[PDB]
Structure formats: structure tokens, C-alpha cells
Amino acid sequence: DTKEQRILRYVQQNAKPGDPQSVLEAIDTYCTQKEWAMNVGDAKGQIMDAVIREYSPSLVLELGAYCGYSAVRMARLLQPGARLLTMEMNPDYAAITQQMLNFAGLQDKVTILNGASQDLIPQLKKKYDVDTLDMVFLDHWKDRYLPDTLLLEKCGLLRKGTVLLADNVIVPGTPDFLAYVRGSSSFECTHYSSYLEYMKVVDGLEKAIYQGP
């Protein structure tokens, strides 16, 4: 019995089937009251919500799904026909995420790619019929944010205006990625100060908009 299985069971026992808001609030309640877990959480998630609503992306890539909290959070705000692709290398967690999306009734909007971002990113265009991404949510191991950004650019997946939105740029921190995009004329960056999920430790999201080659 894993913490992720516990989160899922608590959602099935407490949330309303087909109600993404209810599912979010259930996961937040469990992780606030019973066991901390690395979901983006409600404070940063409200910022995510506002960004999603501003850009109305048709195609979103998420890096790191975990239990599907952020996937539910973003998918519930997508326009009809818009898509989220989420990459998750832990098969146990990917299983839990799929069940979480099913419960929320979001399964038709979200596609889970099992495996490591660095292996899956080069297969996106061919295997998933992707041209360029409108938005990317980076929230996997922090040492991959920079390498996967370079890899996205190499594979032609970024267009002028693609929005990168990065979690945890303060804590645990992503120093190479943050130095890189803030220093590069290829990105326009904005910092949104907030708090680490379920705590009062300061963290923040960085928005880095690709400006083209």
C-alpha cells in the first residue's frame, strides 16, 4: 500500500465523480491533513489557473505527472478539443494518474506518455502528431528542466510565444534552468512568487516565453 494509492483511494471515497474541482480539493485536503506529497498544490495551482486562462493553449505538454493533480488542474480549464500530454517515467505513478483522470472524467482530454521525458520528447511529433507546443509545464526532476528545454528546442517543438511554466524554481530550486532562461534572449521571463505546496516555505513559478530562434 503506497502513499499514492492512499491519495487515489481517498479521492474515490471523498470526491464527486466527474467533478475535477472536487478531486483537486480532495487531494489537497488529504495532503494537507494526512501526508504531504509533491503536488503543485492550491496556492501555486491558482497561479497556474490564471496563466492557463490567459493563454488558452490548444496543446499542453506536462513533464512529471505524479498522481495527476496538476494534469486535472490544467485539463479542467482547457477549451473543447484542446489536449494535454503528460510524461511520467514511474509506472506506478502513471497508473495512479490515469485512474485520477478517469475519476475526474478528464480522460478524453489527457494522454499519458509512460517513460522518461528525454526518450519521449523526440517521439512526440511522429507518435502523437504534434507540430509545436503552446505551453509546457515543467515539474519533473529539477536537474532535467534545462536539458529538456534544450531538447524541446532541438526537436523543433517550441514556437515563438510557446509558454514554459516551471514549478519549484526556488525550492527545491532549478538554478541552471533559471539562470539560463533569464539570461537568454530566446526567452522573456516573469516570476510569480508563491509557497511550496501545503507549506509556508516560499517557492515560485517562472514563466519563460520562447521568443523564437
Ligand SMILES: C[S@@+](CC[C@H](N)C(=O)[O-])C[C@H]1O[C@@H](n2cnc3c(N)ncnc32)[C@H](O)[C@@H]1O
Ligand atoms: C513533482 S512530481 C509531478 C507533480 C505533478 N506535476 C503535480 O503537480 O501534481 C515529479 C514527477 O516527475 C516524474 N519524473 C522525474 N523525472 C522524469 C522524467 N525525466 N521524465 C518523466 N517523468 C519524470 C517523477 O516520477 C514524479 O512523478
Ligand SMILES: Cc1ccc(C(=O)c2cc(O)c(O)c([N+](=O)[O-])c2)cc1
Ligand atoms: C526529499 C524531498 C525534498 C523536497 C521535496 C520537494 O519539496 C518537492 C516539491 C515539488 O513540487 C517537486 O516537484 C519535487 N520534485 O519533483 O522532486 C520535490 C520532495 C522530496
Ligand SMILES: [Cl-]
Ligand atoms: Cl541526459
Ligand SMILES: [Cl-]
Ligand atoms: Cl497549497
Ligand SMILES: [Cl-]
Ligand atoms: Cl512551513
Ligand SMILES: [Mg+2]
Ligand atoms: Mg513541483
